[PDB]
Design a protein around this motif. Structure first.
Motif, PDB file in Angstrom:
ATOM      1  N   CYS A  45       0.826  -1.176   0.000  1.00 29.31           N
ATOM      2  CA  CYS A  45       0.000   0.000   0.000  1.00 29.31           C
ATOM      3  C   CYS A  45       0.856   1.218   0.000  1.00 29.31           C
ATOM      4  O   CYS A  45       1.869   1.294   0.719  1.00 29.31           O
ATOM      5  CB  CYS A  45      -0.974   0.061   1.164  1.00 29.31           C
ATOM      6  SG  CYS A  45      -2.153  -1.329   1.279  1.00 29.31           S
ATOM      7  N   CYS A  65       0.550   5.669  -0.555  1.00 24.62           N
ATOM      8  CA  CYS A  65      -0.311   6.800  -0.696  1.00 24.62           C
ATOM      9  C   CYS A  65       0.438   7.908  -1.400  1.00 24.62           C
ATOM     10  O   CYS A  65       1.648   8.095  -1.201  1.00 24.62           O
ATOM     11  CB  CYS A  65      -0.850   7.288   0.643  1.00 24.62           C
ATOM     12  SG  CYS A  65      -1.572   5.982   1.721  1.00 24.62           S
ATOM     13  N   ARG A  66      -0.269   8.608  -2.227  1.00 23.56           N
ATOM     14  CA  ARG A  66       0.260   9.680  -3.056  1.00 23.56           C
ATOM     15  C   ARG A  66      -0.764  10.776  -3.106  1.00 23.56           C
ATOM     16  O   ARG A  66      -1.920  10.504  -3.396  1.00 23.56           O
ATOM     17  CB  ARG A  66       0.522   9.188  -4.501  1.00 23.56           C
ATOM     18  CG  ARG A  66       1.568   8.096  -4.639  1.00 23.56           C
ATOM     19  CD  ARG A  66       2.910   8.560  -4.115  1.00 23.56           C
ATOM     20  NE  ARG A  66       3.916   7.509  -4.184  1.00 23.56           N
ATOM     21  CZ  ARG A  66       4.628   7.070  -3.142  1.00 23.56           C
ATOM     22  NH1 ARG A  66       4.274   7.401  -1.905  1.00 23.56           N
ATOM     23  NH2 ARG A  66       5.636   6.239  -3.335  1.00 23.56           N
ATOM     24  N   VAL A  79      -3.938  10.254  -1.398  1.00 23.49           N
ATOM     25  CA  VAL A  79      -4.777   9.212  -1.959  1.00 23.49           C
ATOM     26  C   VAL A  79      -4.070   7.893  -1.735  1.00 23.49           C
ATOM     27  O   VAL A  79      -2.900   7.754  -2.101  1.00 23.49           O
ATOM     28  CB  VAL A  79      -4.977   9.417  -3.492  1.00 23.49           C
ATOM     29  CG1 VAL A  79      -5.912   8.370  -4.079  1.00 23.49           C
ATOM     30  CG2 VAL A  79      -5.487  10.821  -3.793  1.00 23.49           C
ATOM     31  N   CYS A  80      -4.725   6.948  -1.126  1.00 21.81           N
ATOM     32  CA  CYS A  80      -4.083   5.689  -0.848  1.00 21.81           C
ATOM     33  C   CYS A  80      -4.479   4.609  -1.824  1.00 21.81           C
ATOM     34  O   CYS A  80      -5.667   4.374  -2.098  1.00 21.81           O
ATOM     35  CB  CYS A  80      -4.301   5.260   0.585  1.00 21.81           C
ATOM     36  SG  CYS A  80      -3.563   6.403   1.809  1.00 21.81           S
ATOM     37  N   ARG A  81      -3.485   3.968  -2.348  1.00 22.05           N
ATOM     38  CA  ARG A  81      -3.632   2.912  -3.289  1.00 22.05           C
ATOM     39  C   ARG A  81      -2.989   1.652  -2.738  1.00 22.05           C
ATOM     40  O   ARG A  81      -1.787   1.627  -2.444  1.00 22.05           O
ATOM     41  CB  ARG A  81      -2.964   3.285  -4.626  1.00 22.05           C
ATOM     42  CG  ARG A  81      -2.953   2.143  -5.634  1.00 22.05           C
ATOM     43  CD  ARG A  81      -2.177   2.480  -6.900  1.00 22.05           C
ATOM     44  NE  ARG A  81      -2.791   3.564  -7.682  1.00 22.05           N
ATOM     45  CZ  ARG A  81      -2.472   3.869  -8.954  1.00 22.05           C
ATOM     46  NH1 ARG A  81      -1.519   3.184  -9.596  1.00 22.05           N
ATOM     47  NH2 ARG A  81      -3.102   4.857  -9.569  1.00 22.05           N
ATOM     48  N   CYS A  82      -3.767   0.647  -2.543  1.00 22.14           N
ATOM     49  CA  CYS A  82      -3.232  -0.627  -2.190  1.00 22.14           C
ATOM     50  C   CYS A  82      -3.156  -1.471  -3.429  1.00 22.14           C
ATOM     51  O   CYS A  82      -4.181  -1.899  -3.969  1.00 22.14           O
ATOM     52  CB  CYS A  82      -4.031  -1.319  -1.093  1.00 22.14           C
ATOM     53  SG  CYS A  82      -3.887  -0.548   0.551  1.00 22.14           S
TER      54      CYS A  82
END
Length: 18
Positions: free
Chosen positions: A5, A7-8, A11-14
């Motif tokens: 996971c 985050c950028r 915004v968190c993207r797993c």
């Protein structure tokens, strides 16, 4: 095959890759 996971811009993207 490994999940990670990150985050950028608050915004968190797993995502999983390999």
């Amino acid at each position: 095959g490994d999940c990670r996971c990150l985050c950028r811009r608050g915004v968190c993207r797993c995502i999983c890759t390999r």
